[PDB]
């Protein structure tokens, strides 16, 4: 099954590049916090659960646009399409291994991301982000960010859409594509499209908007304009 094929390839390259980003950003903060503060175990175990929740939607683009690049290098996606298949590979194949794998992050971000850095918060007593449930904003805004963390909670739809729109730049290639020139511009293309998505938070609630469609403001339009 080609669904299982592209799922397994992107599902392993997402793990590899996820290890690259996470196990590099750990050693980012480790060296200078050990230079500042004057036992690496709980240092790494505090660095990791609020990095595997952070960088995974920023590693999906160095997953499904790099492993699929090596997949497209052998001229296999054109044979997929020529054998009777379509744009359905993006949604109905890559999301089949994306939404469980970002479902992992949207479960971790409640289960053991906040409470799992709470043991580091406990270790701050020996040592030298607005992440809570729906009841926090109710008395946070009342006494601002009117459900601005609707995005941080229900990210994975827009996290899907930001690479749904970007993946057409790889399964629509020019064939004169060396890919080390063009998929990096294709990554920097959608790089702002989940960041300027977020910095335009007050841009619609600067006049007042229901946050259901006020925390979706270019995201509902991206897959609208990006169906090919």
């Amino acid at each position: 099954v080609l669904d299982r094929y592209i799922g397994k390839t992107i599902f392993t390259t997402i793990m590899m590049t996820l290890f690259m980003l996470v196990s590099l950003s750990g050693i980012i903060k480790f060296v200078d916090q050990l230079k500042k503060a004057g036992g690496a175990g709980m240092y790494t175990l505090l660095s990791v659960p609020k990095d595997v929740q952070i960088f995974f939607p920023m590693a999906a683009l160095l997953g499904a646009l790099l492993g699929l690049g090596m997949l497209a290098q052998r001229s296999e996606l054109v044979v997929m399409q020529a054998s009777g298949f379509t744009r359905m590979q993006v949604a109905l194949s890559v999301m089949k291994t994306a939404i469980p794998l970002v479902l992992l992050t949207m479960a971790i971000g409640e289960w053991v991301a906040p409470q799992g850095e709470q043991m580091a918060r406990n270790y701050r007593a020996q040592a030298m982000p607005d992440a809570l449930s729906i009841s926090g904003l109710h008395n946070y805004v009342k006494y601002r960010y009117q459900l601005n963390m609707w995005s941080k909670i229900f990210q994975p739809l827009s996290v899907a859409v930001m690479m749904l729109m970007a993946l057409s730049f790889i399964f629509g290639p020019l064939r004169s594509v060396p890919m080390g020139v063009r998929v990096v511009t294709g990554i920097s293309f959608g790089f702002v499209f989940y960041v300027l998505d977020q910095i335009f938070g007050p841009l619609t609630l600067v006049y007042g908007i229901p946050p259901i469609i006020g925390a979706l403001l270019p995201s509902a339009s991206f897959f609208l304009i990006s169906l090919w």
Binding site: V1, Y5, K8, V78, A82, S83, G84, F85, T86, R175
Partner: protein, 235 residues
């Protein structure tokens, strides 16, 4: 039951390679596209199936303005393709590739696909290659797999670009037999290779291109009787 390409033109970054080789394929017909290197062959298949854009072009299946429809839309309308370059799913197996092409046809059933994959593995002698990994094949082995792979999608029209690249003659006989079976079953096939003595020996008719110009035409009898083919291509 009729397709006709028209007005085909492409210029790869300033230099023009194709000037209006307007070809025709109909149902129940085996067609050739012989000619030298660089003669707009693979470019013509790219312009028909949708891999590159064009300059002009008219692709009509009896009424169809699929001439601007993209690659996947044309392959849904019924044009099958086989690449010149080696185009196997690498980490899969042969049974995985054939069944994975069979998973695209969501109109058959889960038993019919097994039966068809068994028939094709029996005909292409790849039953002892069913266990073999995709990238663990070897040349014409993989080409037989890719031919059976194009067969497994089973559209009304199939455009084959070098399906005789390094294949053993007994399997050439077998593939020619299967193409005759499907032609007797009512399919349209556009083949090209440089196997003269078996490409002309199967084709109902053929096209002769040279550097972008369709310098000849016709049945392979008069293609052999043509004096200008040895002048350019045959020898």
């Amino acid at each position: 039951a009729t397709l006709t390409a028209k007005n085909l033109a492409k210029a790869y970054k300033g230099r023009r390679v194709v000037e209006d080789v307007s070809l025709t394929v109909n149902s129940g017909e085996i067609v050739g596209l012989l000619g030298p290197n660089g003669a707009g062959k693979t470019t013509t298949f790219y312009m028909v199936v949708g891999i590159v854009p064009r300059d002009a072009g008219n692709i009509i299946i009896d009424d169809d303005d699929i001439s601007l429809l993209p690659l996947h839309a044309r392959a849904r309308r019924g044009i099958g393709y086989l690449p010149q370059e080696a185009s196997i799913f690498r980490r899969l197996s042969v049974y995985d590739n054939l069944m994975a092409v069979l998973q695209i046809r969501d109109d058959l059933s889960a038993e019919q696909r097994e039966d068809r994959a068994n028939e094709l593995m029996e005909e292409f002698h790849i039953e002892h290659l069913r266990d073999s990994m995709g990238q663990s094949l070897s040349g014409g082995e993989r080409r037989r797999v890719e031919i059976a792979r194009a067969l497994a999608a089973n559209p009304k029209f199939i455009l084959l670009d070098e399906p005789f690249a390094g294949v053993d003659p007994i399997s050439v006989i077998d593939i020619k037999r299967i193409i005759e079976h499907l032609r007797d079953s009512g399919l349209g096939v556009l083949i090209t290779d440089h196997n003269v003595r078996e490409t002309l020996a199967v084709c109902e008719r053929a096209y002769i291109v040279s550097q972008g110009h369709l310098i000849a035409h016709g049945t392979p009898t008069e293609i052999l009787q043509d004096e200008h083919v040895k002048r350019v291509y045959l020898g």
